[PDB]
Design a protein around this motif. Structure first.
Motif, PDB file in Angstrom:
ATOM      1  N   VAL A 114       0.578  -1.469   0.080  1.00 19.09           N
ATOM      2  CA  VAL A 114       0.367  -0.213  -0.017  1.00 19.09           C
ATOM      3  C   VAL A 114       0.922   1.213   0.371  1.00 19.09           C
ATOM      4  CG1 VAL A 114      -1.582   1.334   1.345  1.00 19.09           C
ATOM      5  CG2 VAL A 114      -1.728  -1.548   1.053  1.00 19.09           C
ATOM      6  N   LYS A 115       1.781   1.039   0.748  1.00 17.76           N
ATOM      7  CA  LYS A 115       2.720   2.235   1.266  1.00 17.76           C
ATOM      8  C   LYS A 115       4.222   1.701   1.223  1.00 17.76           C
ATOM      9  CE  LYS A 115      -0.551   5.768   1.656  1.00 17.76           C
ATOM     10  NZ  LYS A 115      -0.851   5.268   2.008  1.00 17.76           N
ATOM     11  N   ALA A 116       4.760   2.208  -0.199  1.00 19.89           N
ATOM     12  CA  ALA A 116       6.334   1.615   0.286  1.00 19.89           C
ATOM     13  C   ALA A 116       7.305   2.542   1.406  1.00 19.89           C
ATOM     14  CB  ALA A 116       7.419   2.412  -1.151  1.00 19.89           C
ATOM     15  N   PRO A 117       8.342   1.753   1.473  1.00 24.40           N
ATOM     16  CA  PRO A 117       8.784   2.139   2.838  1.00 24.40           C
ATOM     17  C   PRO A 117       8.840   3.937   3.075  1.00 24.40           C
ATOM     18  CG  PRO A 117      10.262   0.257   2.691  1.00 24.40           C
ATOM     19  CD  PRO A 117       9.499   0.277   1.380  1.00 24.40           C
ATOM     20  N   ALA A 118       8.751   4.192   3.912  1.00 25.31           N
ATOM     21  CA  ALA A 118       9.430   6.121   4.277  1.00 25.31           C
ATOM     22  C   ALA A 118       9.116   6.409   5.569  1.00 25.31           C
ATOM     23  CB  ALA A 118       7.426   6.262   3.615  1.00 25.31           C
ATOM     24  N   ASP A 119      10.297   7.175   5.573  1.00 28.99           N
ATOM     25  CA  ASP A 119      10.604   7.822   7.357  1.00 28.99           C
ATOM     26  C   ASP A 119       8.570   8.507   7.113  1.00 28.99           C
ATOM     27  OD1 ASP A 119      13.003   8.562   5.483  1.00 28.99           O
ATOM     28  OD2 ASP A 119      13.085  10.692   5.958  1.00 28.99           O
ATOM     29  N   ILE A 120       9.373   8.061   9.040  1.00 30.95           N
ATOM     30  CA  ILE A 120       8.594   7.592   9.815  1.00 30.95           C
ATOM     31  C   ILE A 120       7.533   8.763   9.625  1.00 30.95           C
ATOM     32  CG2 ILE A 120       7.594   7.364  12.151  1.00 30.95           C
ATOM     33  CD1 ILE A 120      10.118   5.391  11.964  1.00 30.95           C
ATOM     34  N   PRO A 121       6.143   9.265  10.321  1.00 27.92           N
ATOM     35  CA  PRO A 121       5.639  10.794  10.005  1.00 27.92           C
ATOM     36  C   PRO A 121       6.170  11.412  11.073  1.00 27.92           C
ATOM     37  CG  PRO A 121       4.595   9.213   8.486  1.00 27.92           C
ATOM     38  CD  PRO A 121       5.752   8.703   9.493  1.00 27.92           C
ATOM     39  N   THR A 146       2.702   9.196  17.146  1.00 28.91           N
ATOM     40  CA  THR A 146       3.318   8.500  18.280  1.00 28.91           C
ATOM     41  C   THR A 146       3.544   7.190  17.522  1.00 28.91           C
ATOM     42  OG1 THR A 146       2.606  10.355  19.002  1.00 28.91           O
ATOM     43  CG2 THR A 146       2.314   8.465  20.650  1.00 28.91           C
ATOM     44  N   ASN A 147       4.818   6.282  18.147  1.00 30.02           N
ATOM     45  CA  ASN A 147       5.109   4.905  18.354  1.00 30.02           C
ATOM     46  C   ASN A 147       5.473   4.440  19.524  1.00 30.02           C
ATOM     47  OD1 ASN A 147       4.552   4.955  15.309  1.00 30.02           O
ATOM     48  ND2 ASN A 147       6.294   6.032  15.257  1.00 30.02           N
ATOM     49  N   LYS A 205      -1.205  -1.825  13.100  1.00 24.18           N
ATOM     50  CA  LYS A 205      -0.057  -1.180  13.667  1.00 24.18           C
ATOM     51  C   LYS A 205       1.096  -1.711  14.333  1.00 24.18           C
ATOM     52  CE  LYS A 205       2.335   3.155  15.111  1.00 24.18           C
ATOM     53  NZ  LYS A 205       2.067   4.153  15.977  1.00 24.18           N
ATOM     54  N   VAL A 233       5.212  -1.996  16.150  1.00 23.74           N
ATOM     55  CA  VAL A 233       6.306  -0.907  15.937  1.00 23.74           C
ATOM     56  C   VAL A 233       7.160  -2.180  16.927  1.00 23.74           C
ATOM     57  CG1 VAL A 233       6.640   0.716  17.230  1.00 23.74           C
ATOM     58  CG2 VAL A 233       4.774   0.614  16.307  1.00 23.74           C
ATOM     59  N   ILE A 238      12.638  -2.654   6.485  1.00 20.02           N
ATOM     60  CA  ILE A 238      12.507  -0.693   6.241  1.00 20.02           C
ATOM     61  C   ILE A 238      13.518  -0.777   7.296  1.00 20.02           C
ATOM     62  CG2 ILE A 238       9.999  -0.125   6.000  1.00 20.02           C
ATOM     63  CD1 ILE A 238       9.784  -1.750   9.120  1.00 20.02           C
ATOM     64  N   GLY A 282      14.195   4.357  11.061  1.00 20.56           N
ATOM     65  CA  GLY A 282      13.467   5.322  10.921  1.00 20.56           C
ATOM     66  C   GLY A 282      12.417   5.313   9.762  1.00 20.56           C
ATOM     67  N   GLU A 283      12.593   4.206   9.232  1.00 22.15           N
ATOM     68  CA  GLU A 283      11.235   4.698   8.007  1.00 22.15           C
ATOM     69  C   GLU A 283       9.425   3.165   9.043  1.00 22.15           C
ATOM     70  OE1 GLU A 283      13.368   2.155   5.402  1.00 22.15           O
ATOM     71  OE2 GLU A 283      13.570   3.957   4.325  1.00 22.15           O
ATOM     72  N   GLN A 284       8.985   3.319   8.344  1.00 24.13           N
ATOM     73  CA  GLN A 284       7.819   2.461   7.947  1.00 24.13           C
ATOM     74  C   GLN A 284       6.692   1.806   7.022  1.00 24.13           C
ATOM     75  OE1 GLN A 284       5.334   5.693  10.642  1.00 24.13           O
ATOM     76  NE2 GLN A 284       3.729   5.098   8.225  1.00 24.13           N
ATOM     77  N   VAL A 285       6.540   1.308   6.875  1.00 24.17           N
ATOM     78  CA  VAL A 285       5.922   0.323   5.166  1.00 24.17           C
ATOM     79  C   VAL A 285       4.328  -0.285   5.809  1.00 24.17           C
ATOM     80  CG1 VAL A 285       6.649  -2.249   5.975  1.00 24.17           C
ATOM     81  CG2 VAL A 285       6.351  -1.149   3.634  1.00 24.17           C
ATOM     82  N   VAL A 286       3.977   0.157   4.692  1.00 21.37           N
ATOM     83  CA  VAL A 286       2.068  -0.651   4.933  1.00 21.37           C
ATOM     84  C   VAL A 286       1.545  -1.366   3.783  1.00 21.37           C
ATOM     85  CG1 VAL A 286      -0.032   0.333   4.705  1.00 21.37           C
ATOM     86  CG2 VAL A 286       1.574   2.205   5.534  1.00 21.37           C
ATOM     87  N   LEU A 287       1.614  -2.881   4.175  1.00 25.01           N
ATOM     88  CA  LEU A 287       1.527  -4.244   3.545  1.00 25.01           C
ATOM     89  C   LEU A 287       0.031  -4.781   4.057  1.00 25.01           C
ATOM     90  CD1 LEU A 287       2.449  -6.539   1.892  1.00 25.01           C
ATOM     91  CD2 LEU A 287       2.279  -7.914   4.162  1.00 25.01           C
TER      92      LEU A 287
END
Ligand SMILES: OC[C@H]1O[C@@](CO)(O[C@H]2O[C@H](CO)[C@@H](O)[C@H](O)[C@H]2O)[C@@H](O)[C@@H]1O
Ligand SMILES: OC[C@H]1O[C@@](CO)(O[C@H]2O[C@H](CO)[C@@H](O)[C@H](O)[C@H]2O)[C@@H](O)[C@@H]1O
Ligand SMILES: OC[C@H]1O[C@@](CO)(O[C@H]2O[C@H](CO)[C@@H](O)[C@H](O)[C@H]2O)[C@@H](O)[C@@H]1O
Ligand SMILES: OC[C@H]1O[C@@](CO)(O[C@H]2O[C@H](CO)[C@@H](O)[C@H](O)[C@H]2O)[C@@H](O)[C@@H]1O
Ligand SMILES: OC[C@H]1O[C@@](CO)(O[C@H]2O[C@H](CO)[C@@H](O)[C@H](O)[C@H]2O)[C@@H](O)[C@@H]1O
Ligand SMILES: OC[C@H]1O[C@@](CO)(O[C@H]2O[C@H](CO)[C@@H](O)[C@H](O)[C@H]2O)[C@@H](O)[C@@H]1O
Ligand SMILES: O=N[O-]
Ligand SMILES: O=N[O-]
Ligand SMILES: O=N[O-]
Ligand SMILES: O=N[O-]
Ligand SMILES: O=N[O-]
Ligand SMILES: O=N[O-]
Ligand SMILES: O=N[O-]
Ligand SMILES: O=N[O-]
Ligand SMILES: O=N[O-]
Ligand SMILES: O=N[O-]
Ligand SMILES: O=N[O-]
Ligand SMILES: O=N[O-]
Ligand SMILES: [Cu+2]
Ligand SMILES: [Cu+2]
Ligand SMILES: [Cu+2]
Ligand SMILES: [Cu+2]
Ligand SMILES: [Cu+2]
Ligand SMILES: [Cu+2]
Lengths: 341, 341, 341
Positions: B328-335, B339-340, C35, C37, C107, C110-115
Motif C-alpha cells: 500500500v505504501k513503500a518504505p518511507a520516513d516515519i511521519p 507516536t510509536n 500497527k 512497532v 525497513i 526511521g522507516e515504516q511500510v504498509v502491507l
C-alpha cells in the motif's frame, strides 16, 4: 461407600507383555483395581553393561501397561516402600484433575496412597511420576513412566464402522537416558540416585540422550527376547515415550491402522511407513503380518536405533509369499558385457 | 517365468526432476524395471567447498525418485561396482518382507542382485541402504537414500471424491550430514569412507548435524538451479528424510493438499503453513501457485534453513495479483506527527 | 482507492491476552488495520535474572495475536523506529506472495511500510521477521515472531457440522533462546544485539536452546500471572513456535478439539493427551475445564518444561467432581501385613 460398582483386581505383567483383558465387553462399568510399587534400583541399560540409577513402577522400564474400558473407574494403590530414598507420585494422562493425580498421590518412603480416576477418554496414554519442579523430568527419565489403554467397550474400530480385533498385543516403552561421562568419555557409576542427580541434570540440560532403549535396555527385545508372531496375525503395537519424540517403523512391514496421537475417538491412518509418537504420549499401530522372518522395529532416527539402543525384533513364523517379494537373481558377479555408469 | 505380465524399463533421472510417468492409467499391472548403481565418491556439500565421503544410489543425493502404480511389480537391479569399497543393499519402505528387501540384496563390490516387490501400498516412501548394525545409519547419513512413489491407478484425489492432477513434480530429498571437525573447528577431509568412519560416528552419536541439505549440498536448488513454475500450475513437492525429522514450508505459499505421513489412502490436510516429515518417511504437498516471484522452500527450523544449508528456491513466472497482496505504501520516513510507543 | 470496503482499526493487546473480536460474524469483509512497532531491547528471560538482547514486535515475546475473519483484508503498518539498530520486515504465513510480505516490508531504522494481504486461508498462523540470509533465524530466535488467527465467518466448528464457541482465548507463544555462556558456564551479557550476534550464532548452530519460554521468560505465566479459568468454560489455547517443534500438554486435562497443524479447514482431533506444534507453525486446542485447581501447561519434553522455562499455569475456580477423580485413601503408612515385592 458411595460408588456401588463391582470391583475387579488386575494382576499386572511385565512389559512387553500385557495382562489378560477383553477387547469388546458387554460387562458394565467396574472399579478396576491396580497396585503399583515404586522400586529404585541400579539397572543395566546397554550391551556393554553400563549401569544407572533407575527409578521404576513395578521394577520395570517401562512400567506395566494397564488396560481398562471406557466408563470403568481405575483405583490405583501406589506404594513407596521404605527402602526407597525419594518421594514419588503418579500422573495419569488418561485422568481428569489434580495434575492427572499427581497432586493427590505424593508419598514418602514408607507410605502408600489410593487414587481413583474415571476412564472417560479412550486411547493409549502415558502415566508417569511427577513430584514437582526439576524432580519431574528427573524421575521420568530415570524410568518412572508407563502407559494405560482405555478401550472402547465395543473394542477397536477403523473409524469407518468396521470392527478391528488384534490377535496379539505388545507394549513398547521407549526411554531416553542421560548417563554422565567422565573426562575420558566413560560412563560414570554412582551408589544412589541422589548421588547421580547433579551430573545427570547437566546431561539432561543438553537435550541429547546417551541411550534410547526399548523395555529398559539396549538389546532387551532382540536375541532370545524377540517378539513372536505368525503370518496372518493382527498385532497391536502400543508405543510410549513420556519425555521425547520418537518415529516408529516396522522394517519390512507397515502400520495398517495407526493412531499416532493414540486416541481411539479419531480414525486411524492407513498404510503408514513410519509414524510419530510426540514426547509425552502413547500411540498405537495395528499390523497384519504377511511374511515370515525377522523384522526390526525401530525409531527411524537410525543413529538412535542402531547406535543408542532403540531396536527390537519380531520373529514371525509362517510361509514366504513370493508374489509380495522375491529374489529374482541372487548376488552374482556383474556381467562382463555390463555398462554401469 | 511364473509372473506373466508386460515388462517396462524405466530410465531414472537425477533429482529434483522425475522420470516420465502417467498420473492416471488404464494400463493393467506391469513389471516396472529399474537399475540402481551404487557410487561411493567424495562430494562437495556446502558453499565453502566442504567435502565429505558420500555413498549414493546412481551418483546423487538423494537417490532418484522411482514412480509406479498400485499393483505393479517393481524389479530392481542393484549394482555394486568393484571400484566401491563396502557392501551395500536396499530397503524399500514400500515393500513387504525381508527387511524391505535388505535381507535379499546384500552385495559385495563386484556383484549385482535382482529384487522384485509388489507395489501393494500407495504413497511416497523412503528407500535406503541398510547393511546391518551401525552400518545402517552410517550408509544412510552418507547419502544412501531416495524415495519411490506408488500412485493409485486413477491418480491422486482429495479424499472427498475429487481428482487432483499436478502440472509439475519435484522431489526434494533432505540429508542430514555429520562432518567431523578438527580441534580448531575446521571440517576434516579423508581419502576414503572407511577412513572417515570413526570420526563421523562420534559426530553422529551427538545427534546434531553439521549440515542439512536439499539435493546433496547447500545452495543446490538456489541460484541458477532454482525450481521453475508458473502462476496457475499445481505443483507436487515430494519431500523425504530417511533419518531425521523435517518441517517443510513454502515461504509465500501454502500446502493446498498435504499428505504429511505420505500415504494416499489417507485424505490430505488442506491449507497448511508448515508440515512435518517424520524421519524415515516421505511426504508430499500439492500447491497451486497464485503469485509470481521467488519463493523459498525450507525446513522451518530457520537455523537449519539459513545456516546449515536447507533452503531451495522456486522462481515463478506470471502476473502479480494485487488483490491477494499489495504494498500500500513503500518504505518511507516515519511521519513527524507519529507516536510509536 | 481501488479497494472499497469498510476499514476497522484494531488495538492490539499484549500476550497472552487477545484483542476484542467476534467469533461468528455476519459483517461482510473489511480492511482490518493493524500497527506493529519493532522494539529492540534487553529483556529478562529467566528466574535468575539472565538478560539477552531481544528484538520484538510491539515490545513483547511473542508479538501480539491478530484476529480477523476469512475474506477480510489485513492492512499492517510496520514501524521501525530510529532508536533501533537493524533493518526489519514481516512474513505472514497467512499471506500469499512476496515471501509472505517479507519482500515488500524491509525497513531501515526511521522507516515504516504498509502491507495489505487478503485473509484467504483459515487457521492460526505464525508471523515473523525475515530480513534475509542468516538474519532470518537470528531475528526470529531473538523474539521477532507472533501469530494471526483467521476465523471462519461462522466461527469454529467440529468438522462434523457442529459449531464450537470458546468462553476464553489465550495465546501461548513459545520461544527457543540461544544465550552465550563464558568458559565457566555463566550466561554472557552484551550492550547491543549486534555485539551479541557472533557468540549467539555459535550457540544457534548447535541446535540446542539454553531456554524455552512462554510469553518471553521462564515463569512468565506462573505465580501471580497464572491464566484464569472456571469450571465449565471452553478455553481456546493458541500455541505458536516459529523455529522449533513443541509438544503441548495440559497437565490434568486434555485437548478436547485440537488442530495441531492449526488450520480450520481440517477437522480437529478429539481427546488428545499431548499434541505437536511443528516449528514454523501455530496450532490450537479447545478444552472445557471439568475440575478446579492448578493445571500446568507444558511442552512435554519435561526437561524443557521444568529446567529450561517452558511451564505455564492455569488457576481454575469451581467445585471438585469426585466422580471424575478422588483420593480414596490419603497417604498412610504401608500396612504391616502388606507384601510389596
Ligand atoms: O565419550 C565417547 C568416547 O568415550 C569412550 C571411552 O573413552 O567410550 C565410551 O563412549 C562410547 C559411546 O557412548 C561407549 O560405546 C562406551 O560404553 C563408553 O566407554 C570412547 O571409547 C569414546 O571414544
Ligand atoms: O486396510 C488394511 C488392509 O491392508 C491390507 C488390505 O486388505 O492389505 C494391504 O496389504 C495387503 C498386501 O497384500 C493388500 O490386501 C492390500 O491391497 C494393501 O493396502 C490387509 O493386510 C488389511 O484390511
Ligand atoms: O567450529 C566452529 C568454528 O570453526 C571454524 C573454523 O575454526 O569455522 C568452521 O565452522 C563453520 C561453521 O560450521 C564453517 O562456516 C566453516 O566452513 C568451518 O571452517 C570457525 O570459523 C568457527 O568459528
Ligand atoms: O482447496 C484448495 C483450494 O485452495 C484454493 C481454493 O479454491 O484457494 C484458496 O486460495 C485461493 C487464494 O485465492 C482461494 O480460492 C480459496 O478461497 C482459499 O482456501 C485453490 O488455489 C484450491 O481448490
Ligand atoms: O554451564 C552450566 C554450568 O554453568 C553454571 C555457572 O558456572 O551455571 C550457569 O548454567 C546454569 C544452567 O544453565 C544456570 O542455572 C545459571 O544461570 C548459569 O550461571 C554452573 O552453575 C553450571 O554448573
Ligand atoms: O467431544 C468433546 C467432549 O468431551 C466431553 C464429551 O461430551 O467429555 C469427555 O469428557 C467428559 C468427561 O466427563 C465426557 O462427557 C465424555 O464422555 C468424554 O469424551 C465434553 O467435556 C465435550 O463435548
Ligand atoms: O454379561 N456378559 O458377558
Ligand atoms: O526393566 N524393564 O523392562
Ligand atoms: O523429591 N523428589 O525426588
Ligand atoms: O527400513 N528401516 O530402517
Ligand atoms: O489401454 N489404454 O491406454
Ligand atoms: O547429488 N545430488 O543431487
Ligand atoms: O559393511 N558396511 O559398510
Ligand atoms: O516464512 N518463512 O520462514
Ligand atoms: O449486520 N449485523 O451484525
Ligand atoms: O515480553 N513478552 O510477553
Ligand atoms: O540485517 N539484519 O539485521
Ligand atoms: O503430565 N504432565 O507432565
Ligand atoms: Cu518418582
Ligand atoms: Cu505428563
Ligand atoms: Cu550402502
Ligand atoms: Cu528404513
Ligand atoms: Cu527483525
Ligand atoms: Cu516462516
Amino acid at each position: 461407600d458411595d460408588l456401588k460398582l463391582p470391583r475387579q483386581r488386575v494382576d499386572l505383567v511385565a512389559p512387553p507383555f500385557v495382562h489378560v483383558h477383553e477387547q469388546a465387553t458387554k460387562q458394565g462399568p467396574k472399579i478396576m483395581e491396580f497396585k503399583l510399587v515404586v522400586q529404585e534400583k541400579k539397572m543395566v541399560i546397554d550391551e556393554k553393561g553400563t549401569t544407572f540409577q533407575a527409578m521404576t513402577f513395578n521394577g520395570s522400564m517401562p512400567g506395566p501397561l494397564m488396560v481398562v474400558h471406557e466408563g470403568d473407574y481405575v483405583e490405583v494403590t501406589l506404594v513407596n516402600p521404605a527402602t526407597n530414598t525419594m518421594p514419588h507420585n503418579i500422573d495419569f494422562h488418561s485422568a481428569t484433575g489434580a495434575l492427572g493425580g499427581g497432586a493427590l498421590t505424593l508419598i514418602n518412603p514408607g507410605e502408600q496412597v489410593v487414587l481413583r480416576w474415571k476412564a472417560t477418554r479412550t486411547g493409549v496414554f502415558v502415566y508417569h511420576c511427577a513430584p514437582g519442579g526439576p524432580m519431574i523430568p528427573w524421575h521420568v527419565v530415570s524410568g518412572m513412566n508407563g502407559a494405560v489403554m482405555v478401550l472402547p467397550r465395543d473394542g477397536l474400530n477403523d473409524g469407518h464402522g468396521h470392527s478391528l480385533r488384534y490377535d496379539r498385543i505388545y507394549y513398547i516403552g521407549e526411554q531416553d537416558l542421560y548417563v554422565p561421562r567422565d573426562e575420558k568419555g566413560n560412563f560414570k557409576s554412582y551408589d544412589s540416585p541422589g548421588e547421580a542427580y547433579s551430573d545427570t541434570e547437566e546431561v539432561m540440560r543438553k537435550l541429547t540422550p546417551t541411550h534410547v532403549v526399548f523395555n529398559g535396555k539396549a538389546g532387551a527385545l532382540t536375541g532370545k527376547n524377540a517378539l513372536n508372531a505368525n503370518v496372518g496375525e493382527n498385532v497391536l503395537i502400543v508405543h510410549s515415550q513420556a519425555n521425547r519424540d520418537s518415529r516408529p517403523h516396522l522394517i519390512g512391514g507397515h502400520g495398517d491402522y495407526v493412531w499416532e496421537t493414540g486416541k481411539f475417538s479419531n480414525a486411524p491412518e492407513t498404510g503408514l511407513e513410519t509414524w510419530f509418537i510426540r514426547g509425552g504420549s502413547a500411540g498405537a499401530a495395528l499390523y497384519k503380518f504377511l511374511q515370515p522372518g525377522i523384522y526390526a522395529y525401530v525409531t527411524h532416527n537410525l543413529i538412535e536405533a542402531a547406535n543408542l539402543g532403540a531396536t527390537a525384533h519380531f520373529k514371525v513364523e509362517g510361509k514366504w509369499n513370493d508374489d509380495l517379494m522375491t529374489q529374482v537373481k541372487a548376488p552374482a558377479d556383474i556381467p562382463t558385457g555390463s555398462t554401469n555408469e
